[PDB]
Symmetry: C3
Subunit: 679 residues, 3 copies
Amino acid sequence: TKFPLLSSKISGLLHGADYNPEQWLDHPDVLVRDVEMMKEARCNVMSVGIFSWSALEPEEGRYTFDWMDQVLNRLHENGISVFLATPSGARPAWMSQKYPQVLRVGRDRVPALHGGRHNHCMSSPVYREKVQLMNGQLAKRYAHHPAVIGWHISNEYGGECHCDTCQGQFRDWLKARYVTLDALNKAWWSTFWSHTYTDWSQLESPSPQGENGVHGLNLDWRRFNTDQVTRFCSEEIRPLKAENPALPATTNFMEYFNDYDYWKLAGVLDFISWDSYPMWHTRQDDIGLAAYTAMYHDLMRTLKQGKPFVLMESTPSFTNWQPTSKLKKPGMHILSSLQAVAHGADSVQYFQWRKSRGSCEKFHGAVVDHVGHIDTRVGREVAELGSILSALAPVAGSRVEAKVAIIFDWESRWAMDDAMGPRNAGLHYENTVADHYRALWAQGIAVDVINADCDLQGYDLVIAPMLYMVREGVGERISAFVQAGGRFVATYWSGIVNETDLCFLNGFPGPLRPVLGIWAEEIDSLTDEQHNSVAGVEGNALGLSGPYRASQLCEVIHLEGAAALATYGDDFYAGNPAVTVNLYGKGQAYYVASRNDQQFHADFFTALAKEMKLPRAINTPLPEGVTAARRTDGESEFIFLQNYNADNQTVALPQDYQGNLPRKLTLPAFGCQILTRKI
Amino acid sequence: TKFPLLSSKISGLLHGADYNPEQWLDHPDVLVRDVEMMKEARCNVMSVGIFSWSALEPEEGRYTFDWMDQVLNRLHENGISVFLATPSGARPAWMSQKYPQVLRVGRDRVPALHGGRHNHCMSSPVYREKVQLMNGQLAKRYAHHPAVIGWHISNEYGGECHCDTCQGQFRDWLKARYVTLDALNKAWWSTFWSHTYTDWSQLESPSPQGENGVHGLNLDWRRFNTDQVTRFCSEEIRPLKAENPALPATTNFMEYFNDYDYWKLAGVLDFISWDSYPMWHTRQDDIGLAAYTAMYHDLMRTLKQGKPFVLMESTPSFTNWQPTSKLKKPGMHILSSLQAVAHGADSVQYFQWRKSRGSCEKFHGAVVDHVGHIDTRVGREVAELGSILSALAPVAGSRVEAKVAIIFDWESRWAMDDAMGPRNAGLHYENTVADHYRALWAQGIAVDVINADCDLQGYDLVIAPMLYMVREGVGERISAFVQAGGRFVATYWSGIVNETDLCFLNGFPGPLRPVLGIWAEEIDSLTDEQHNSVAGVEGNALGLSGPYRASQLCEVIHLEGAAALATYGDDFYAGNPAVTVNLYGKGQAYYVASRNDQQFHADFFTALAKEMKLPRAINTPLPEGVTAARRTDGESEFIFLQNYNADNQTVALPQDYQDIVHGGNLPRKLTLPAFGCQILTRKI
Amino acid sequence: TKFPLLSSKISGLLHGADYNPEQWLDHPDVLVRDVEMMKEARCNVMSVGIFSWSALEPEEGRYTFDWMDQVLNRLHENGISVFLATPSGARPAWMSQKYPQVLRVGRDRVPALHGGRHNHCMSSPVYREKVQLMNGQLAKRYAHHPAVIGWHISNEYGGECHCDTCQGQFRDWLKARYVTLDALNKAWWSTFWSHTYTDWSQLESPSPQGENGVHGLNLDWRRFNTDQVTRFCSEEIRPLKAENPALPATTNFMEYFNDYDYWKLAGVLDFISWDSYPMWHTRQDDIGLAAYTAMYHDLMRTLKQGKPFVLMESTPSFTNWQPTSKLKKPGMHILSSLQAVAHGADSVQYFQWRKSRGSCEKFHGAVVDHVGHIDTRVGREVAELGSILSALAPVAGSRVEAKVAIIFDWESRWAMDDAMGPRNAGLHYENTVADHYRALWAQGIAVDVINADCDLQGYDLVIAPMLYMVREGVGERISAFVQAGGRFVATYWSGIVNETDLCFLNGFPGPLRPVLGIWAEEIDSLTDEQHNSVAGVEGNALGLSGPYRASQLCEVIHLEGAAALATYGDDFYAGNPAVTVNLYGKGQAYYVASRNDQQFHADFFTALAKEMKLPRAINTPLPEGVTAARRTDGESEFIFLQNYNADNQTVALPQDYQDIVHGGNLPRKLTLPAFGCQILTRKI
Ligand SMILES: [Zn+2]
């Protein structure tokens, strides 16, 4: 009926920040003020210890935990929970100097020097052992500290190491996966360019001066790295769990992060967390950007089948590392933070409570500016959001009931982006997926963002833009899902290769060819100056009309059972099917042969939602840039109405919600209103 | 009267592909189907063995030739010839592992790891010896196999190596060229920035962290690489010639390839072959691309004085490695293939017969798609092309009779591009030469593309765009050619330096100053937003009018006997001469002082062609984007009408011609389709 | 009343060039012709020996001075002085070969090979000793040669070395400055990302594969390189002085050069010299570029409190290293050269007297072209400038009397440009400072360009654009300056950090918050597509109107005593103060909260000039693109009228002046040609 909260100790939404009091121990007045202001702002959680290695172990084997004892006791005394971090995000300088193997070797084989962060070798037995020791200390000292509600494992795991140890490890991994060199060579088609591996010691990680044209290799390298960090993360976790199995562990994920398959890494965590820094107010409007963000929130919720996630980081204002450091306009901080909550966040947390005074993130936004207090515009909006969050306790643990699934698949992505062709100028996978998402999000229809391994049975509608790789089982599951009454939508450049990037030989859409009822003979590629158009067939079942712009990729297809919903208007393939639907069992499978404009997706998916009677957050038309999200505890529903436009927008309510809101609602620019009601 | 065919066994044009069966030995069904479709596509040649080294020598010393025996037998049983390749294009991984000396060191001094292709050390004694062994095996086993018609030496030679051994060779090379450090220091002007070399061990190839501002060094490093590869190629050929001196050998060249002077590497080959992947349909139109490709075709022919060449590689559809993988539009494959033939190819071949299933060229085009048959759009057009090429047997061996020559010179290009000034933002040498070429190509007037060392004496017209380097003899030959009644055209930034990039001191156009009858005082450099104009003087002999746009470079010249054909419209040199003609002996030498638009070139060269009465492929006006190319056996002519436009184009024939392909006489009014080509034949 | 000339031997302005006769020893006729042409162009100075190391010591220990003895004797016999150079800008090849420690190791830790220039390790004991010997030779031989008037130390010092010696040197530098690691860790806030240094050996120069996010370290790395080069240049100077303490020494500086704090380096020189290559005629107009160049001239003069400087290098035409090699238009060479003189140059010199024949600078401009004479447009204009300069003898040693100072501070720039935010897309510091300058330059108001350490007392008006870093003393001096009746102007992003890039905690703008009477709460960052507007408050003291356009950066401020002169017209801070003034003692301090357009600066600064009654070169309205500069010897004033428009421009004189160059009295209405310059003189 409702998910358990992050801890039995908490009873609503969390509000908080990364906290680095270790930078300020020379000013105890700052530490006392920090806490007074936390409570003023209604922050009830902080993440502590993240970059504290040198503050915990300034010399090898010599520890100094006192400041942390103090910090944890003070937060506890003041009713503030802690996510305690393991400090593996940044080794001390002494450790680098004494054990250089903890440093990485780059893809270009350049050895790193000490510095930066998140740049440890993941094979290094020394570093893994020091992590065990450090984590063992933190656990035996703090796993029963009443403040502590969970573990923040490392920080923002990322990157790759090509040192000789990592090469050895990679060779072993390959040898476990394919059992003979025979299997490997076949899987990679290595006879091409006489790349035949005749001994295991010949295998090597990719490099610009060596080999980076063997797709199978590049792909498995990414899988291998995923397994490296997943094992690294498990090992970090275990000494912690040994002292207290009841404390949950997470690690903080990044925006559409490419290095690791988060579906794999997620299987080692108790709950999901991520870090979101959208470049608000940098484009024509914030609508697209909002939908892109919202889709990733959904992904984060989907990784544990609806279980709420933590927004571990975000800025209250601007960042320090983007081309511009734009201020969030008044209201937008509430709106962006509530958007996380709207799609399943049970905590809104920020990077930095208090701005660092020196170093590279001193101009990153925080709750407490350099001016030393929170009587600033930023501070006041943070505090105001604190109030709002504390007033949303019933939303904590509530579920998102999505009947729509969109596939975003890391392995497909990796093999697609690595491939040479069919548009080396850019495929824009993230963006394309999101373009599909946007037409649903515009209607306030809930979406889960699964990968191709997830079970399709609970859904009415499954959408797979550019599912380039169709692994074993996937086409069968899809086919079964449609047959049983499901509806499927796939696009151009789906069903092309298998697990190791070998093309199918049965004609393209491959394992999906029978369900889609079409053959994709060839794909045309378009420059950024070129276009085609798609126009609906009179009487077509979705009422598509247009014409709509088609850009970048246009496939030439042949009907094999499917009927044409729309045709191309231009080029040598003019008059040919552009959009099709196929009847398969009691379901229907749609195919979209070209990359089309926003209007196309809006027409296509609003028709398809009307026909399928998909549930919406509110049953009323939403103006452009206004969206709606719904969470429920089984007893009430909570509707998040959001206005990403930069002017006022008015919505008509189809029923009564809670006192009681008027029948007709003006949302301010960047406004948000939460409507509640019994089901 | 007519060149020899590639083999005594063949009787017409060849049609084929690179073929890689060794990737498919686990599916014998595929190998059978391969050959069936090959015949059904009218493919009569395959290149075999190019990347087969690990398929031939999986361990050091141990060979496995059975599969190749089978392929060659099967192709021969089915009436398909073979260009058998030496596999030095890609060494096996064991070889890299055991003998790392085979790997290169980059210009940035980064050593390469195993992988990629075409990236072997050209000094390495071990690699050269391993290649000798392999090539000896191949020759001894197959040099008399009835399938084999020729040798495909390596694959797309290219790149450079800076390992200590190559540095050693480079020092020896330099010392044999200049005898003393005195001559070298003077040649390169090394006193500048105190770069005087006082010992041969101080000489080093260019590097970004070392020396790359000494122009003479950069130039000779390129010359040195050229000779390294020419020697490498000779050594490869010899054990093959040793088993059978009658088999020809080629190596496949690249599009306007910059690394090596192809005029030197061609001297070791029997015939010329190249690989062409123009980005069709990616621009406003395909006209300029078409002429650019045509010009290179002419160069490939010219390299051996009119001898037909092989189009060793092309795509039937798209490539895998460009920004876009555009499909050839219906008809364009036919047209781009027949273009190669029109300008002297006696073979049309494709990169890949069958798509690789995996690895980096899996989405490169081929005859046989992953779908496993050739009843596809690409397939059907390849097959149709195969029909047309079998119908064009009489064209094989025919000649291209060009009375115009254009100079494209690798050494001049190298020194000109390496220079600091006069426009670092871009000189666009290949593009500039081709801009000249296009005004002739648009008229159906044949052109050879010679370098500055070729003999000028058979030509009526010689054109030299940006002949920056004028080596010893060139100025003299040019002058003689004009004096004897020839016509010569040179542009801005010609006659600037000598063999080692030393500027002439006698005023610029240097050695060409007398014949041109002008002094080029100074060259002005213009941003991409800045322009000038050129306008005809009233009564000028070429009938030049305009105004025409001038961009990028504008020279300030002084008449010294020459007359002004046109003047500048704008800037502080407005009213000054911009185009000139000079009478010298019985001939005329023209100079164009600024980089002018396509319209300028058209007026200039159509006027000049009319006046000179240059022969055309057809004596009728050709619409824009329609071209005509002529080949001849001395008895008949074969006219290739080509429409590069994306719509229909209708032309009138001023004579009666036969349809060599479909039979009968063509009508007088002839509509070429979009991307169309039609072949007219007629007795002289 | 007037500064001393560079030497007791000279009596007016110098006119000359870098001269490299050592490239031409095989053609004595050239060396004779050189000197004849040098006098014909009225060139009275040459810089000699700059890249002559291998011409002076072709083997280790073994010298060859005879060609130089010759050269110096011949120049002296022909009334031409010499800045003799020390040749440390380019080591010989043998020295690199035998002592590899003289080569640099790059920021990326890649070790350099021999080649290039200005790329010596500055810690290298061998290279410093070799420089000691070589300089000691030159000095003992030539310190009393009658031709020699100064020392040209090295050539354009630049770059950095990261070899293990320089790392050691750096650790000793940091230890001598911080004393303990405690202090260092605190200054750099190194507890951030666990960067706490626990041993001096852990410290390392920045790198891309190591550490380059610690600002404290990046900033101190640049201070350390400044000290390294300052010491290196001292050490070069001392043997020269030891032989003749009367000979002045300079080193030639570069355009807004970033690697070194020139205020530190200048302390070691007797006089200032620099090298100017503006890209004239490459933009919409040359006005902005001209103001930008003028500002640097003023900076060069300000380095020694008004002491005239040497324009050591410039081109007579084009360069070889820019995207385009544009020709200076007719008149522009005169104007660009006289601009240097108008802002305090007592010498106008060019890179290269005679074009090198062979290396990378062979297409860099020079007085003598490859054509071998100076009867060329370029030569003629050089000669004509020669005349003009000789006619301006009285200007030599004259002063610039500026009551306005702009702050250009290296340390502030470093720390600001290294910061992450508030606009990584670009802060454009040089351009922003110059935007302020232009509004004054446009009025012909003189400006000294100081750093934040200079004494402010002599000025009426001090302008600090983006004074990001406010070091100890600066805020107090500024506040004192205002309090005493001074007027201060500051912008957005001033008063943010201290000496080690630690943020202030009182509220921005930190130490200037009292004097400015505002609090800057936050700064907003705008994409290149976005703008806001600034509009004057009715009855504001400066008569600001607008709206003006604001870009890139806009701060939200709060008034704390100051009054608003303007407000924003857009975004969420619309209606908020955008421009403010504060009364503080007898002065007024202005704050400009956003980066505004040209028209704002014009309105702001013309109103502020009229109100303050600042002195103009001429008391007349100047057309757009027409500027005026004033020098004085205490008796007369020399006014340089300058037209950077490409068309005629007419100006009304408010008094009567003599034409010092051409003679007689000028009228009250005067029309300057395109790129025209007229020099007006008059008694005070
Ligand atoms: Zn590693």
